[PDB]
Design an enzyme around this catalytic site. Structure first.
Site, short mmCIF file in Angstrom:
data_model
loop_
_atom_site.label_atom_id
_atom_site.label_comp_id
_atom_site.label_asym_id
_atom_site.label_seq_id
_atom_site.Cartn_x
_atom_site.Cartn_y
_atom_site.Cartn_z
N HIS A 12 50.93 24.40 4.08
CA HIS A 12 51.30 25.47 5.00
C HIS A 12 52.29 26.51 4.59
CE1 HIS A 12 48.84 23.58 7.97
NE2 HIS A 12 49.45 22.42 7.78
N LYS A 41 38.19 22.52 4.59
CA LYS A 41 39.04 22.36 5.74
C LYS A 41 38.70 23.56 6.50
CE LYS A 41 43.51 21.75 7.42
NZ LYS A 41 44.97 21.57 7.17
N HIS A 119 53.86 18.46 10.21
CA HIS A 119 52.55 18.82 10.72
C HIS A 119 52.59 20.15 11.43
CE1 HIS A 119 49.70 18.74 14.22
NE2 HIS A 119 50.75 18.56 14.99
N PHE A 120 51.64 21.02 11.19
CA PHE A 120 51.61 22.29 11.90
C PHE A 120 50.79 22.03 13.18
CE2 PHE A 120 50.36 26.54 12.96
CZ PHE A 120 51.36 27.34 12.48
N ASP A 121 51.31 22.37 14.35
CA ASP A 121 50.55 22.07 15.54
C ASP A 121 49.82 23.25 16.08
OD1 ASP A 121 50.19 19.67 17.09
OD2 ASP A 121 50.93 20.81 18.76
#
EC number: 4.6.1.18
Length: 124
Positions: A12, A41, A119-121
């Site tokens: 990210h 992805k 984690h990217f939400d």
């Protein structure tokens, strides 16, 4: 091994550019970051901010993660982000993406000691 925290940066983080440089950016970065190695992805977001800036988000606004867990935080400021969404002509192993730059608030799950993003939400 690859720590949760280093995998976040690999997937990210992209501080070297302030925005989505060109239409080429996604196809290049998705592959570059090994996001197109086991499959394509479907979608991925890159943050063009400094690593200190993104880590500081773990002390900002606490919000519910999409999964119901509560370790998510929203950034007070909007950040520069590039959104990569897989196209239709995208056929693995030839993954294709549409690059989309924007400036929004990011939401990340954080954990650990130190408390870092893992984690990217979402982004809003």
């Amino acid at each position: 091994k690859e720590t949760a925290a280093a995998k976040f940066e690999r997937q990210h983080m992209d501080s070297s550019t302030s925005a989505a440089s060109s239409s080429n950016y996604c196809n290049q970065m998705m592959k570059s970051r090994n996001l197109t190695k086991d499959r394509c992805k479907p979608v991925n977001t890159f943050v063009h901010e400094s690593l200190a800036d993104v880590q500081a988000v773990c002390s900002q606004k606490n919000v519910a993660c999409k999964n119901g867990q509560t370790n998510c935080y929203q950034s007070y400021s909007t950040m520069s982000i590039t959104d990569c969404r897989e196209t239709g002509s995208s056929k693995y192993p030839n993954c294709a993406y549409k690059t989309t730059q924007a400036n929004k608030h990011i939401i990340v799950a954080c954990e650990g000691n130190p408390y870092v993003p893992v984690h990217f939400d979402a982004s809003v």
